[PDB]
Specification:
This protein has 1 helix and no strands. With about 45 residues, it is mostly helical. The chain has one domain. The longest helix has 14 residues. The protein is elongated. The protein is about 30% helix and about 0% strand. One of its GO terms (biological process) is defense response to bacterium.
């Protein structure tokens, strides 16, 4: 976006080195369990 290898921007809108990782977790967790039965979703 304005960067992208550890965070993408800031208070602008982007930010995130973290919200992809918690997105991977939260989705695949509640699909199986609380973390995927084994965290084998890929983990992020």
């Amino acid at each position: 976006k304005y960067y992208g290898n550890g965070v993408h921007c800031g208070k602008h809108s982007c930010t995130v080195d973290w919200g992809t990782a918690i997105g991977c977790i939260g989705n695949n967790a509640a699909a199986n369990w609380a973390t995927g039965g084994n965290a084998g979703w890929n983990k992020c």
